[PDB]
Structures are given as structure tokens and as C-alpha cells.
Design a protein around this nucleic acid. Structure first.
Ligand SMILES: [Mg+2]
Ligand SMILES: [Mg+2]
Ligand SMILES: [Mg+2]
Ligand SMILES: [Mg+2]
Ligand SMILES: [Mg+2]
Ligand SMILES: [Mg+2]
Ligand SMILES: [Mg+2]
Ligand SMILES: [Mg+2]
Ligand SMILES: [Mg+2]
Ligand SMILES: [Mg+2]
Ligand SMILES: [Mg+2]
Ligand SMILES: [Mg+2]
Ligand SMILES: [Mg+2]
Ligand SMILES: [Mg+2]
Ligand SMILES: [Mg+2]
Ligand SMILES: [Mg+2]
Ligand SMILES: [Mg+2]
Lengths: 129, 205, 150, 82, 80, 123
RNA sequence: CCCGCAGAAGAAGCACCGGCUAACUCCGUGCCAGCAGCCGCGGUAAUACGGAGGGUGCAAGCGUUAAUCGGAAUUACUGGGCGUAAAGCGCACGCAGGCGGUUUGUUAAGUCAGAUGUGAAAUCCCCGGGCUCAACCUGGGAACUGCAUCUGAUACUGGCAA
RNA sequence: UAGCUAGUAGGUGGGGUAACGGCUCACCUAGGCGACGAUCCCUAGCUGGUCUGAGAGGAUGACCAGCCACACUGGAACUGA
């Protein structure tokens, strides 16, 4: 049941990507957006798009580089059944450094590179590479 | 504690000269070396990776005449220390006094160089050190005790000492029979025919 | 830098009217010490024929691997059939610690300082193989920017 | 009353004392309040052999601690200012 | 105040024998999930005044009874 | 499976049934010889193995194996026994320290004498 | 600790060698006597029994037994499974419990940040120092991943409101 | 093992202790605990740390130091800081 939408984002992506699907859409939200941001700003998607008002619609443009899909993997990490939180010094780094981790903090949804510089930490939403 | 057994037997099984009869003659023969370390030595030891791994460290051991226990602790100390564990291992081994007595020529083979140590016939920075494993450090100064100087052994000792490739890391008289451990030997000094990483592996699992 | 090593050799039985007819199999790995590795199977009624026929198979079927110095960029997971394997950069202490069997592919392939471990079945044909695929999927420590950049 | 004394954390035949402030009633090597020096009597003439945070010892003797007999010597043997 | 506790009431029905619920979340020390570890406290409130359902602020006093080491400070909300 | 589930009922590690109640983890245990049988082994094998049922110091009656070639042990011999089954003789899970208590060492053994408990023959 | 004295003089053993697992032959025996951690050896050529020669491994120890953890990702939090191999309750409704779409405001408990205090000494670890070395002893750091208090941050979760 | 509890939970006063206090008493209120596991049963001194493990863990609590507890078994108080 709708229960975890953030996995649904992470997933609709993972799926559509593997389906060499040009775009992909879904119900939006403050939260979905903050991440669609980091995803773009880190260059895993071409560009997003929210086209509604009462029933908003997040839309992401996917990317394919060589023949592959750019996003080689995208997992949840925190989730309703089991919340994760890491302090700053205990923040994770994906693929040794390549690829990234999306961490929400008292100063907004930002990557691990980011939050690590910001000198803080929060709930580690998901891993991307 | 000391090996004590017929010592060529070793070189033969180990397949190489461990310089344990060191003395006069070189490139063995006048022995039998190789094709029969026992009654079936004749045979091809087609052998597991474990074995080649085993025999390497054994070789290194029969050389400095070190028993299992001590060698283990060498390895352990080697590994503790930063640097290539295998190099560090080789370092420590050389740091041995008895070794740095045969290496300065005062003794035919390390075995002999040792009897000297244990027989209080050596003095580091002045004082007498009769324990074969006394680790020697840079700038150290190992001499022969005046009492029993230029006595038998120690002559021919310092003799064919020059026949040998001859160190570098240590400068050494020959009249006084003193000599200075100048530096810790590097990888590139000594070796060629010894394979650390194997005897790192033997002790890794 | 020819460099080659066989990993496992084995016997197998076929069974016909007249009995068991046996035969051997060879598993080999070849690499240049600078990336590039392959494995070959190849079986044959006698051993040297089996290993020979294998070393060959390994010469082709060779893939290459975006190393990073003597080590790996990021820690990688691999998995084929029952063998599920894992290896890690290891800012080389000394390095090269793995179960002889995937030490074999590592070694030759040029990786100089990893720590590795195999889970599931230690069945060589599948671990050496889960590893190769392992190092293969492993992506370039900058052609990840190629990936993104844009 | 509290006291400054030598705990003997030596080693058979080569004693090496800790000097500690503690409830005089406790064991010679037991619970203490704080450490305030040391005293190797085999110091050897080389270097060190009787380091001793005086300005604490001070403090406690202010707060009423008695000093041993040996320790009292050490203090009047460290000299005091030089 | 040297610290204070909040918590809902849970039981008012007894001549000042007020007991208060306190609610923390805590990371399971083994499986990391966060659960509700509740605490009940027996607090004093002279001339009985809180009521079942009230949020209340509380402080640690000395023993008022074998059970009671806390008085209340303020009330907050009612008619839940 | 579930995290909740692990939370309610933690993972539990099976405990280890021993194979050798030489009671309380003991290096060996003294006993008195109830019977000196000799019975025969399981499936593939075939032999006349020597054993003895033994009342132990701690009350257990256990059937133990006698090792070596030949032995003098009868009813009422006091022996010492160690862990060590004998698969061949199902049920037998202990061995008898040759050359312990009333147990003699194997006559004439030259190789591996310390097992079988035999003095260094006056060479 | 130091000096002299005599004379190699007083000072080597234990397990193993079928595969795993480093080390092979002969004689005896003949499903017997027996071996065995696991596989499994013994019925006439036994590298597996027993002895011998030789060899491998450790050494004032060596084997055997007992015992903890390890390898065991074989209770899997990190890190596992349930079509046919161990495993979906015969089916449903539902209390507690767990979880919960989307928006704004508020709260600051979970979360995060900083500061302060505390986290005994020994131990562990890093760099040294002292016993002829080492074990051992010792200086000084580092570490004790923890707990509490105060002040802050509000993205996420929890509470209140609509 | 699913219910447990009459000084039991709270109040008021008297008494008591070096001291807060159902500590004790008298009287009043009818409470208090409990599936976030009470009650019952079984086992057990706790810690620093010790062994092991790459870690996370697992196992453990001799020797050293800290705390508790006991001094033939049950029970008592006297002296005294
Ligand atoms: Mg020794
Ligand atoms: Mg072999
Ligand atoms: Mg045997
Ligand atoms: Mg025969
Ligand atoms: Mg485990
Ligand atoms: Mg499984
Ligand atoms: Mg089934
Ligand atoms: Mg069904
Ligand atoms: Mg939401
Ligand atoms: Mg400490
Ligand atoms: Mg020193
Ligand atoms: Mg909210
Ligand atoms: Mg009163
Ligand atoms: Mg492990
Ligand atoms: Mg004692
Ligand atoms: Mg009494
Ligand atoms: Mg009194």
C-alpha cells in the first residue's frame, strides 16, 4: 500500500530505466522533489518537471550515456519499517566515493558530499551510483 | 634449542646452499647436494602450493638457524610494524646479532658466529652481549673481545669474509675486529632467491 | 607477462553399456598483470589435454578491467550460481589475501593488494567467474563522470 | 585521614613505586584518590628517577594530608625549587 | 529547573497519588528500529488538580513516600 | 525475517549437545570396570574389538574402548578414560588411557609408544 | 654482575608420513591382529595394521583429552531462506501492536549540531625509557566508539491544529 | 507461569531515624503493579576488562583494581565515629 512512496520513486526509476524508458512520472510531493533535485544536480537524470496543482505530478527525464542507463543502481536505506540516521562522522560513502548517498538534514535534502561539508548529518534516505 | 643435526642434509632438501658448512669449499658438491635428500630424494616432489609455501619459510629458517616459536614472533613483530610485512620480516631476521657477526666476517658460518656470541666473545657499544638474538640497531658497534682476539677461527673467519659479495650497510675493520652496523639493510641488498610473500602467506591464514 | 595458472582439475564419469568412461576437466586463468583476464574450461579424456585445451579457451574469452593503480577503485560484489563473492580495495597493507582460487584471477589480472572472501559454494568454476564478472561490472573511476558529467 | 604514600608496582627485585594520595586505611596498592608522582629507586644515573607533581602534593597537605616517611624524604631530596 | 519531564496523566483517581506516563523513542540496541519505551512515575500534586488525559510538567524532588520522588510543576491541556 | 519479528523474538543460537559426557568438561575420568566384553563392529568391518563397561567416579556407567594389541584388564580394574569414539562400535564414545591406574601399557610397542602408554625401552 | 679453573666435558625427546596434510619403502599379518579427526584402511605384493630403514613436522618439550571463539553468511543486525530441497497457518473477520497518501502552520520527543562535565587506575594501542636480549618493568600520548547537562538547527519521523 | 497486591497505593496526624520515607502506628481515601511481561519458576555476585572475531558479534568474569555480599547454620542485638 502507498505506505512508502520514496521507495516507489527510487523504484519507478530503477524499473523504467531498466526498461530503457525515456521519461517517467508519479504523484509528487515536497519530498520527492527535493531528491529529484539532487538526482539532477548530480546528473543522474536529465531534468524533472512537476505538472499539476491539486494532483501534482513529478516527472523525471531519464538519461542514457553509452548504451547503459546512467543510474546503475538505486536503493532505499531508511524506510518506515526501519529508520536510519547517521551522525556526521558516521556518514556513508557510496562506491568508495563515486556515486552518492542522499541525506536529509536540519538544513534540507543534500548529498553525502554536501552534508559532509556542511558539517552535519541526518536521515540517509537512499543510495545512488 | 639449536638445530644441532647434520646440517648439509638441510641445504639438500631445501635445494640450494644455505651456507651452513659455509667454511672453505664453495658451490658444494663434495657433499651430494640435490638428487637424494633421503632414500627417496631421487624422486620428483610434485607438491601442493602449501608445500612450496612451507619449504620457503623452512629454507629461510634453516638459514638463520631459528626455531619455529621465535620465527613466528619475528613474523608477528614484522607484521605489527608498518612497511611490507615480508620485508619487515627479512629486516628483523638480519637485525639478529649472531647474524651480524657472521656478516662482519668474525665467524665462518652463522652457527660459529653464534658460538662466539654465547661464549661472551663480542661487545656492542662496549659491553658484552652473549645472547644470539640481541637485535642490533643503526650506528651500533660490534667488536670482538680483546681476550681471545686474533685466535684461530676468527682469522680464517675475517678471511673468506672478503670472498663473499660483502655487505654495504656495515663498515668493518679487521685488525681491531670491530665494525659498525651503519643502516638497516634494504630489500635490494641480500635476497634474490628468497620469496617473502610466500612465507607471509604461510602465516596469513 | 604471459602469466597463467590452472585452478582446479577434476575427474568425471559418463557410464555406458560397458562401464564408466572417465575423463578430466581443467579450470584455468590467464592475465597480463595489467588488467585483462579470462578463464577457460575445456575437458578431455586425459589431464594434460584437458589443461592445454583450457589455457587456450582462456586466451580468448578475455575481458579487461578498469583497475586503479595496483588495486580496485570501489569494493565490488559478484555472484554466479551458488558462489557469491566479495572483494575490497584495501589501501594495500601488503594485500593480496583471498582464497587461492580467486587469488588466482586477482594475482594474474594485476590487482596487487585486495582482501577478498567467497560465500555460498566454494565451487571454483562458479567463483572464479563470479569474480571475473565481478571485476568486469566494476565501473571506471571517472567514466562515472563520463556517465554523469552531463 | 588522607595520606601521600608509595604504592609498589615494582616487579620482583626491581621495585618502582607510584606515589599516591589516598585514604590511609586502604591497601598499599588499592583504591586511591589521585596519582601525584612516581619514584624509581633503580632510576640509574642515566636520566630520570623521581618525578613528582609538587603543586598537587601541596594542595592536599593544605587539605590535611600527612606524608609518608620515604615520600617526605623524596620531597626534601628533589630539593624543591631546583 | 534542573531538568523537567512532560508526559500524559494516565491516572488521577487517587488522593494525590498521581501517576504519569512518559514517552521516549529509542533505537533498538541490536536491530536499530525505534520503539516506544514507556515510563510511569508516581508524582505528588497537592490539592489534586490534574485529570486523566492532561499533559503535565514534572520535577524530581526528594522522597514523599516509598514510591514518590517527584512533584508537578505546571499543567498543559485537558479534555483530551 | 521482519525486523519487528526479530525484535519480539531475537535470533537464538542453538546450544551444543556434547558427544562425550565425561561429565563436566573433564580431561578424563576415573572408573571401575563393570564388564570386560569384546564385541564386533558395524557394517563394512569385522573384528573382535575389546571394550569394558565402566562405572565412573561420577556415577555414569559408560562403555569404553581399550586400545592397543593385547591388554590385562578384568572386572574390578580401576581405569582412566578420555574422550574419543570408535565408529565401528556404535555406542562407544570413550577410550582407556593405557598405562593409567591399573591399565597396563601395550607390550612391546616401539612406534607411537606415548599413545598406548609405553616407556622408552632401555635402548 | 665481574674474574680465574677443568674438560665437549653434565645436558634430546615426542607426534607424524593413504587423501585433507609437509614426509615411502621393505618385512610380518591376512575382514585376523588392529587403525581411524573426516573420508575410510585390513581376505597374499598393505605408502592406512605391527616392526624396521628412511623421511616430514615441532623441541625441553611433544602428543592425547577436555574447553571458548574462529572458519559457520550453519540464527544471516551488519549478513540467509520458505513452488518442487527444512519452511505460507485449510480459509477468512478483527482487538492490541507495527506501518501508513497529500498540504500548510505549530511543537521540538525521535534525529542532527555545538559546548561543558563525566566516562577510576591498570589493561589494549602509538612513540619512547630501564633490566646483556626477550618475556618483564616504566614515561607520555592515543583510545574508552558511552552517559548526562546546556544552547542551538527543523529536512525526515513523532505530537497538536486545520 | 497471566494475572499479582491489606502496610498493599496514596492522604492526614503521632512516633521514629544522623537523615527523606508505609520507616512505624492510628484513622481516612481505594488504590498500586501487569503482555514495554507483573506474579511464579529456573540459573546467577556486578564492573573494569579477559579470550576470540576484519568488524559486528560470540564466549567469559582466575590471577590485577573497583563495588556488593558472606565469616560453622538460623536469629539477635550490645559496644562504638
Ligand atoms: Mg623455548
Ligand atoms: Mg604429500
Ligand atoms: Mg598411527
Ligand atoms: Mg606385505
Ligand atoms: Mg556466525
Ligand atoms: Mg540457507
Ligand atoms: Mg518441503
Ligand atoms: Mg494457503
Ligand atoms: Mg508524507
Ligand atoms: Mg582508564
Ligand atoms: Mg630496550
Ligand atoms: Mg510533521
Ligand atoms: Mg509523617
Ligand atoms: Mg567472521
Ligand atoms: Mg587470591
Ligand atoms: Mg551471624
Ligand atoms: Mg550506638
Amino acid at each position: 500500500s502507498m505506505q512508502d512512496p520514496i521507495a516507489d520513486m527510487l523504484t519507478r526509476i530503477r524499473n523504467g530505466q531498466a526498461a530503457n524508458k525515456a521519461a517517467v512520472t508519479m504523484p509528487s510531493s515536497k519530498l520527492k522533489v527535493a531528491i529529484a533535485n539532487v538526482l539532477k544536480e548530480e546528473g543522474f537524470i536529465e531534468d524533472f518537471k512537476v505538472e499539476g496543482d491539486t494532483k501534482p505530478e513529478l516527472e523525471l527525464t531519464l538519461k542514457y550515456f553509452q548504451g547503459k542507463a546512467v543510474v546503475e543502481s538505486i536503493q532505499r536505506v531508511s524506510r518506515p519499517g526501519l529508520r536510519i540516521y547517521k551522525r556526521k562522522d558516521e556518514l556513508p560513502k557510496v562506491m568508495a566515493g563515486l556515486g552518492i548517498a542522499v541525506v536529509s538534514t536540519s538544513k534540507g535534502v543534500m548529498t553525502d558530499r554536501a552534508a559532509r561539508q556542511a558539517g552535519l548529518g541526518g536521515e540517509i534516505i537512499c543510495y545512488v551510483a | 634449542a639449536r638445530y644441532l643435526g647434520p646440517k648439509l642434509k638441510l641445504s639438500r632438501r631445501e635445494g640450494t646452499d644455505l651456507f651452513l658448512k659455509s667454511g672453505v669449499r664453495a658451490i658444494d658438491t663434495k657433499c651430494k647436494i640435490e638428487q637424494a635428500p633421503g632414500q627417496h630424494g631421487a624422486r620428483k616432489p610434485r607438491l601442493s602450493d602449501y608445500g612450496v609455501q612451507l619449504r620457503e619459510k623452512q629454507k629461510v629458517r634453516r638459514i638463520y638457524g631459528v626455531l619455529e616459536r621465535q620465527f613466528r614472533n619475528y613474523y608477528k613483530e614484522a607484521a605489527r610494524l608498518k612497511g611490507n610485512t615480508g620485508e619487515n620480516l627479512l629486516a628483523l631476521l638480519e637485525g639478529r646479532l649472531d647474524n651480524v657477526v657472521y656478516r662482519m666476517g668474525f665467524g665462518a658460518t652463522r652457527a660459529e658466529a653464534r658460538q662466539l656470541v654465547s661464549h661472551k666473545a663480542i661487545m656492542v657499544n662496549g659491553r658484552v652481549v652473549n645472547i644470539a638474538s640481541y637485535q642490533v640497531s643503526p650506528n651500533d658497534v660490534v667488536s670482538i673481545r680483546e681476550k681471545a682476539k686474533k685466535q684461530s677461527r676468527v682469522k680464517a673467519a675475517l678471511e673468506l669474509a672478503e670472498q663473499r659479495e660483502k655487505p654495504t650497510w656495515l663498515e668493518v675493520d679487521a685488525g681491531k675486529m670491530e665494525g659498525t652496523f651503519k643502516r638497516k639493510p634494504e630489500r635490494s641488498d641480500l635476497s634474490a632467491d628468497i620469496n617473502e610473500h610466500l612465507i607471509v602467506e604461510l602465516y596469513s591464514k | 607477462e604471459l602469466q597463467e595458472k590452472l585452478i582446479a582439475v577434476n575427474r568425471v564419469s559418463k557410464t555406458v553399456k560397458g562401464g564408466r568412461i572417465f575423463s578430466f576437466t581443467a579450470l584455468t586463468v590467464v592475465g597480463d598483470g595489467n588488467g585483462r583476464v579470462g578463464f577457460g574450461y575445456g575437458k578431455a579424456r586425459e589431464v594434460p589435454a584437458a589443461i592445454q585445451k583450457a589455457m587456450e579457451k582462456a586466451r580468448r574469452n578475455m575481458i579487461n578491467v578498469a583497475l586503479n593503480n595496483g588495486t580496485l577503485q570501489h569494493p565490488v560484489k559478484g555472484v554466479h550460481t551458488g558462489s557469491r563473492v566479495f572483494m575490497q580495495p584495501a589501501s594495500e597493507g601488503t594485500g593480496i589475501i583471498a582464497g587461492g582460487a580467486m587469488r588466482a584471477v586477482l594475482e594474474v589480472a594485476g590487482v596487487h593488494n585486495v582482501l577478498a572472501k567467497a560465500y555460498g559454494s566454494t565451487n571454483p568454476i562458479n567463483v572464479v567467474r563470479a569474480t571475473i564478472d565481478g571485476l568486469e561490472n566494476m565501473n571506471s573511476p571517472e567514466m562515472v563522470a563520463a556517465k554523469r558529467g552531463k | 585521614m588522607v595520606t601521600i604514600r608509595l604504592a609498589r608496582h615494582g616487579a620482583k627485585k626491581r621495585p618502582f613505586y607510584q606515589v599516591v594520595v589516598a585514604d590511609s586505611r586502604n591497601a598499599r596498592n588499592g583504591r586511591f584518590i589521585e596519582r601525584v608522582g612516581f619514584f624509581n629507586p633503580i632510576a640509574s644515573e642515566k636520566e630520570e628517577g623521581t618525578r613528582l607533581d609538587l603543586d598537587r602534593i601541596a594542595h592536599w597537605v593544605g587539605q590535611g594530608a600527612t606524608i609518608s616517611d620515604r615520600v617526605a624524604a623524596l620531597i626534601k631530596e628533589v630539593n624543591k625549587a631546583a | 529547573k534542573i531538568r523537567t519531564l512532560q508526559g500524559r496523566v494516565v491516572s488521577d483517581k487517587m488522593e494525590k497519588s498521581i501517576v504519569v506516563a512518559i514517552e521516549r523513542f529509542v533505537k533498538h540496541p541490536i536491530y536499530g528500529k525505534f520503539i516506544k519505551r514507556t515510563t510511569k512515575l508516581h508524582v505528588h500534586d497537592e490539592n489534586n488538580e490534574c485529570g486523566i488525559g492532561d499533559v503535565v510538567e514534572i520535577r524530581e524532588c526528594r522522597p514523599l513516600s516509598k514510591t514518590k520522588s517527584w512533584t508537578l510543576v505546571r499543567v498543559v491541556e485537558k479534555a483530551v | 525475517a521482519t525486523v519487528n519479528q526479530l525484535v519480539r523474538k531475537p535470533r537464538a543460537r542453538k546450544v551444543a549437545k556434547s558427544n562425550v559426557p565425561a561429565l563436566e568438561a573433564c580431561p578424563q575420568k576415573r572408573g571401575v570396570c563393570t564388564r570386560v566384553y569384546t564385541t564386533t563392529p558395524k557394517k563394512p568391518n569385522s573384528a573382535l574389538r575389546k571394550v569394558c563397561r565402566v562405572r565412573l567416579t561420577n556415577g555414569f556407567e559408560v562403555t569404553s574402548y581399550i586400545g592397543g594389541e593385547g591388554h590385562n584388564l578384568q572386572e574390578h580394574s580401576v581405569i582412566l578414560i578420555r574422550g574419543g569414539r570408535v565408529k565401528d562400535l556404535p555406542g562407544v564414545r570413550y577410550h582407556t588411557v593405557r598405562g593409567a591406574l591399573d591399565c597396563s601399557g601395550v607390550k612391546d610397542r616401539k612406534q607411537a609408544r606415548s599413545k598406548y602408554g609405553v616407556k622408552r625401552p632401555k635402548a
